[PDB]
Amino acid sequence: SMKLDIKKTFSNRSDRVKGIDFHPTEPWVLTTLASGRVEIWNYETQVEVRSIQVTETPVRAGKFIARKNWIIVGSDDFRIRVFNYNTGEKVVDFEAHPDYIRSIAVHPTKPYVLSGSDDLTVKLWNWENNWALEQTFEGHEHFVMCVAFNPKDPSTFASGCLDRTVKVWSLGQSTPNFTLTTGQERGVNYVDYYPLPDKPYMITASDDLTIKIWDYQTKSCVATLEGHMSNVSFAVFHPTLPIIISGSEDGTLKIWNSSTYKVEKTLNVGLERSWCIATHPTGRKNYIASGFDNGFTVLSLG
C-alpha cells in the first residue's frame, strides 16, 4: 500500500541513452548516448544547456562533478574524458582501460573516480594527482558492469559483475572485503547502496529477471523482487521515498515498496528498452530520470 503522485517533468527523444545523471544545484540532467553524443538538458526550461559529439563509439558512463564544474564520461573507445560544462573545454582525455568502460563513480568528497571495465577490473583515478592511476582492483572474472561508492563509508565501494558476484572493496587493499555470490546466474548488471544510515542494504539487478536486496553485514539476501519480463538493467533505492525503482529491457519502470518488496506501480513511458537511472542527489521534487532506446524522461514523484 502506498500513495504515489508521479508527474512527467520533461521527456525528449534521442538515440539510445546509456548513462544519465542529475546536477545537484542546477536543474540539469546529463545523458550519454550510444551514438557517442552527450547532452545536458535543463528539464525545467526544456532547453539544451550544452551537447558534445564526444566520440563515434557508445558513451555508457557519465557523471557530473559539480564542485569542479565538470562532466566525466567513459566510452567504448576505452577513454575517459572530462569537459567543463560552462566553457566546453576538454579538461582531460586518456585511455583508462584496454576495453569498454561500463560504469563511472565519483567519490563524494575526495578527488577520486572509479571506472569499471570489460577488462575485468576497477581502476581508481586521482584528479588532484594529475589523474594518476592510483590502484587497479583485480578479482572479477567477467565484465565489471557497475561500480558505486558506499555513500555512508566511501572508503569502500561495490562492483557488480557478469561473473555473478558483487565484490566490496576498501581503497588501498587489493582483495575484496567480501564477495557476494548472488545466485543471479546470468550476471550482475547493477549494484546500488541504500543511502540512509538505518539499513546496511545494497541491491543488485540481473539479466535473469530478478532484483535482490542484501544486508552487507550478514551478507544475506533480504528479498528477491520478481516481475520484470526481460533483462533488468538497474534497480536503485530512492533517497527520500520508501521505494525501489527498476527498469528493464521489457520497456517498463517498476516502483516497488521498500518495506514489503511488492510492486506498487509499473510505468510504460513508451521509449522501448530502459537502460539507466538517476535520482536527484538532494531529493529535489523526488526527481528521477531514466534513459531508454528512444530517449529519456524526467519524473517528479510524491
Residue numbers in the entry: 0 to 301
Which of the paper's sentences describe this entry?
Hence, this loss of critical proteins has the potential to compromise ER proteostasis and generate cellular stress. This challenge to normal metabolism is overcome by the activity of the cytosolic coatomer protein I (COPI) polymer, whose repeating unit is the coatomer, a 560 kDa complex of seven distinct gene products (α-, β-, β′-, γ-, δ-, ε-, and ζ-COPI)25–31. Overall, the coatomer functions to retrieve the escaped “client” proteins, such as type I membrane proteins, from cis-Golgi back to ER by retrograde trafficking. In particular, the S protein – a type I membrane protein – is delivered to the ERGIC from both the ER (by anterograde trafficking) and the Golgi (by retrograde trafficking)3,10–12. Here we utilize recombinant SARS-CoV-2 S proteins and tail peptides, including constructs with enhanced mimicry of the coatomer binding motif (clientized S protein), to elucidate the atomic structure of the S-coatomer interface.
Furthermore, our co-crystal structures showed that the Tyr33 side chain of β‘WD40 pushes away the Tyr1272 side chain of the S heptapeptide. This Tyr33 is replaced by a smaller His31 residue in the αWD40 domain. We hypothesized that the replacement of the bulky Tyr33 side chain with a smaller residue would allow Tyr1272 to move closer to the β‘WD40 surface, thereby further strengthening the binding between S and β‘WD40. Therefore, we generated a β‘WD40 Tyr33Ala mutant and determined its co-crystal structure with the clientized S heptapeptide at a resolution of 1.8 Å. Although the S Tyr1272 side chain was indeed closer to the mutant β‘WD40 surface by 0.8 Å, overall, the Tyr1272 side chain was still >4 Å away from the β‘WD40 surface. A BLI assay revealed this was insufficient to enhance S-β‘WD40 affinity. Moreover, this β‘WD40 Tyr33Ala mutation abolished binding to the clientized Thr1273Glu S heptapeptide, suggesting a previously unrecognized role for β‘WD40 Tyr33 in S heptapeptide binding. Moreover, β‘WD40 Tyr33 plays a critical role in stabilizing S tail binding through interactions with the tail Tyr1272 side-chain.
